[PDB]
Symmetry: C2
Subunit: 51 residues, 2 copies
């Protein structure tokens, strides 16, 4: 039981940390997508003014 | 020990799933980052053309 509970603890800690990493990466994805959209809009406006 | 082993299996499956999510989300992060880099390079070229 000592080994089994230690394995349980390590697996649970790893899964929780992985979930936190997943949430952080997803919010990073949405942030970077917003920045990309703003950059594309700026590019379009700049090209029109250039022409 | 039986319950501990079952929870170990569940936790390791969930952690592997979240690790795959991490891999996918980091791939998306890098790809959108590259697209944003291209967009900002285009923006810099556009400002140069404005000048």
């Amino acid at each position: 039981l000592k080994d089994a509970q230690e394995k349980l603890e390590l697996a649970e800690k790893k899964a929780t940390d992985a979930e936190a990493d997943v949430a952080s990466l997803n919010r990073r994805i949405q942030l970077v997508e917003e920045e990309l959209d703003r950059a594309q809009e700026r590019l379009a406006t700049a090209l029109q003014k250039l022409e």
